[PDB]
Amino acid sequence: GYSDRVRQITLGNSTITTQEAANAVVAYGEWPSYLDDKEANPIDAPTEPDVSSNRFYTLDSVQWKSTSRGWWWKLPDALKDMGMFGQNMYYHYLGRSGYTVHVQCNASKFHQGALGVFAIPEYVMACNTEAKTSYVSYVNANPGEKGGVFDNAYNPSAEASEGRKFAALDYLLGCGVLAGNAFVYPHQIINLRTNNSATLVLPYVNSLAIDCMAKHNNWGLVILPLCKLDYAPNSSTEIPITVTIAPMFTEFNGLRNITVPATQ
Amino acid sequence: TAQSTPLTSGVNSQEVPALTAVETGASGQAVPSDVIETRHVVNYKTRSESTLESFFGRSACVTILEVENFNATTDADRKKQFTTWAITYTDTVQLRRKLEFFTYSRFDLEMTFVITERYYASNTGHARNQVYQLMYIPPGAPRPTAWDDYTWQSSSNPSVFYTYGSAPPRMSIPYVGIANAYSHFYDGFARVPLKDETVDSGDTYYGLVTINDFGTLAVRVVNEYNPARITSKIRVYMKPKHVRCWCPRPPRAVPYRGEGVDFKQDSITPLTAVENINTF
Amino acid sequence: TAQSTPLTSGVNSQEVPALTAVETGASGQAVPSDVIETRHVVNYKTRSESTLESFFGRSACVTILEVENFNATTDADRKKQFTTWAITYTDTVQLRRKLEFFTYSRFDLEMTFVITERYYASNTGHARNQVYQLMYIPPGAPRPTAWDDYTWQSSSNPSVFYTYGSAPPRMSIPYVGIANAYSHFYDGFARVPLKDETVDSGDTYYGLVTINDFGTLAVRVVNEYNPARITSKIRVYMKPKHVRCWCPRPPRAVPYRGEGVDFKQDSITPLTAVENINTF
Amino acid sequence: QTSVSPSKVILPRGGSVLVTCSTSCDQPKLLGIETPLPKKELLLPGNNRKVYELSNVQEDSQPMCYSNCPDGQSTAKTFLTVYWT
Amino acid sequence: GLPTMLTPGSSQFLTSDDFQSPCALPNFDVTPPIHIPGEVFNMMELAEIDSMIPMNSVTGKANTMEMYPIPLDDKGSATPIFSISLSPASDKRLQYTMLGEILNYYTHWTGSLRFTFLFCGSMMATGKILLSYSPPGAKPPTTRKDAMLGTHIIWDLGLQSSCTMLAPWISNTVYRRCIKDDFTEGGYITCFYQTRIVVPSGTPTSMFMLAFVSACPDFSVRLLRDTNHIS
């Protein structure tokens, strides 16, 4: 009676239904959970925002053209201004969170294309200057909601001003590894003849037990167009990719006044 | 062992293992007994060398250190008398690439110091046999200013004294990370630049290099100045043992240009273009 | 032990063991108790030294390698700074001849490196004590171009660092053959030249030498250039242990002229002609 | 890695061209010249150096000389022209 | 105190030894471990993951994101869609895959390979594609009546949108080498339009296809060495 293509996911007061889905990837075979008492790093009383922040948040819909080359989001910081998870984050020094990334892109049965949806632990990217090394600013490394785009050309700016940003090169995947090897990460491929949604379940992955979300970006969401979009009547059409992310099993420590980072 | 191969024959049925769907995220799963007819092959071949304890079971080279020993007169000649090296695994490109397969690792480190000498000039006399100090300076202990100051006496810093001509000195350093694993890649800063700071930390370095302080290996020549200038070379080695690793990553393809994950413009082309797609 | 000798006496009967027929392929089978009268000799003599573990139980010499150490200016002087040797047992004529008794063999190999030095010139100063790198390069790892390139750092290649003046370095290499035994003699090519090729592989080498890649032993001097030119000689040794062998063959009679089974024209006459057939 | 000494050859139509192709190695596992032109061999001592004797050169040809050194497959060509009245 | 004798191989530093050593930090209370997800216990856990082959690495499309999609159309030619040797450590289009990078740390490998092919055309584009594996030692297959005689698989297009051509372990040696060697050559692989791919009106004619590579569960390596990508 049941099928693998119809899936409803509910967290808090938010619901995603999908009728042409592929199967869901639990990353590295572990469902996210709270910090156990045998591994706890801080000793303060942890805040568990039970349903106020364990819910789906819908980002901005980027448009996937025929010349679109890729997108990237840093995952505990693309939700920095989303409801109460953006208010649980900056009022606390520590924070761990599991995730349910759901990437939404659909077309007709006459379109074609592929979207490698990745989820990269410690997605450290390269700077866009050759004056200095490991050299990216804070605003350019943490865009938040809008994310960033990749590029099919590496043009390092000789200015140290405009070179403090990610040299988001698509075939080297930012960090100088080939993109055809990126399938060792937890990944799904949106193929516009088979499916229309990619669902990943991401546990908290870090060397520490719990860490500052304001400093440290745990996961990296990556969407690569493997085969470009090609619609035969209108070759320059645009189908939107909408990313909907939920925090899961969040836990925070060290309450204080609000942290407001710089914007420039 | 690895898996054997069962004696199977041909099929004609609705059970189709040759067709998968990699949109679901899982890889291929067909073993060769599925799609063809196979014999029975008892497989005694094991994967014993490919494990992480033997994949990292080599004493790699991480740096080359140079000290000298002569009658120093100027100030640049007094800075050739010792050498302080910040301990890292990124000063070469081969043990680094074997470790950037993995995001997080946990290993007790074993070092060995292979040390050579030479005469600099030809007719400036001779020299006696030499003893070399190698002092592990944790972050906070005073780094040496001159080659014979109060810092080299090492009342609490771990020092080894290698007499030249002996077997190379060896020691094991435990897991000294303050995390529960060494973050090979760290996607974050050291601090948070706040709103309306007069500090203006618009030069905070990205990523990994703002969290790693593993120490300083300061090396002097314990002798005083000989009449003949003795130039030495020291090759610090590392061998990760008791190795555990987590969260695998693709390996480094294009060359490095620093301590980060950066890549230089003139070597962004690792492949060589084939003649056409149909070239065996 | 070997066989004893039974107390037998003379016979007169139809049982005739003295007459065999070597057309059938079997050798002779008469022991001396058959054809004569023998006493009783209890034989305590054993064949313990003639077994294959003791017949190959010597550290033979397989090659002689030369490296130097001086201030290299030209390009030929930079190729004296290191030496890369393709590993084989055929560069001498005595361990080879003991192994070409047998068609196929299976043995863990144990090597030891006995190394000498000398001064080249007389009045060009002196030199410090020296450390020698010996790096085992499997087929595929990059062979060194210069003596101090990226290849010598050996993040995964097995290297040994011999300080000159110590006991000679020793190591055991396992059975690394991709067959189930080392084919001493291989009667076949590496490929099949097809009909109407435009490739024209009419220079494919015969036989053995197109299948053996055992590695490359690259040796440098880890020191920089001393004022005095130090010329070294290195004698790579092999000692087959845990030896098994199959399918015996006649031993080599005439001398060699290469890595194959070839033989030179001026030494096709191994015998010395006797005076006549009746010469004791 | 692979050297062809007669790189620039001028010779009329129909004649013979001596092509010398060797490698920079000591063990040429697989070495040969790729052309559909008739050639027997030329005698040359040495396990490395090598000469093929090409003949009946009619059109402009560019033969490829591979050599299977233990560092990949190598490539060297030669350039030859013809003459007509 | 005790009569000892020094054997050969004393006072050497072997870079692949296994000895004990004095700990320079005695009594270092190490940081207690936590359960980090995704623990790797063996490098052959990474050989069994698919990874795209740069199959379309022709002049102009190499070194960019067009290296991966293989060109297809509706013309139904007799020419091969792609053709590649079976040398997953020394071929110019396989050594940069995730399987190819691990094999360039080793020297000898055995086992069978797994080629999973994703069709990224439209929904209405139906077709059949031949996928073939020929063991070496004959003519390299160019026409369809040469690759049908090997180990092949006829794949159909539709709902289940990923085939799997398996290249079995058919070899004289127990262990092929990780170089371009003549004696341990792997095999010849082609790909033919079985019938052709048919598109209706209002549907693109020129399409693409993605090609993966992984390792079967009888795949194993030996003899660690350095690599030849980095310097």
Swiss-Prot record, chain D:
Domain Ig-like C2-type as annotated: residue spans: 14-76
Origin: domain of life: Eukaryota
Induction: Up-regulated by coagulation factor Xa (F10) in atrial tissues. Up-regulated in atrial tissues by rapid pacing resembling atrial fibrillation.
Post-translational modification: Monoubiquitinated, which is promoted by MARCH9 and leads to endocytosis.
Disulfide bonds: 21-65, 25-69
Location relative to the cell: Membrane
Record-stated family: Belongs to the immunoglobulin superfamily. ICAM family.
Subunit structure: Homodimer. Interacts with MUC1 and promotes cell aggregation in epithelial cells. Interacts with ARHGEF26/SGEF. Interacts (on T cell side) with CD81, CD247 and CD9 at immunological synapses between antigen-presenting cells and T cells. (Microbial infection) Interacts with major receptor group rhinovirus A-B capsid proteins.
Known role: ICAM proteins are ligands for the leukocyte adhesion protein LFA-1 (integrin alpha-L/beta-2). During leukocyte trans-endothelial migration, ICAM1 engagement promotes the assembly of endothelial apical cups through ARHGEF26/SGEF and RHOG activation. (Microbial infection) Acts as a receptor for major receptor group rhinovirus A-B capsid proteins.
Protein's name in the database: Intercellular adhesion molecule 1
Organism of provenance: Homo sapiens (Human)
Stretch of the intact protein here: 28 to 112 of 532
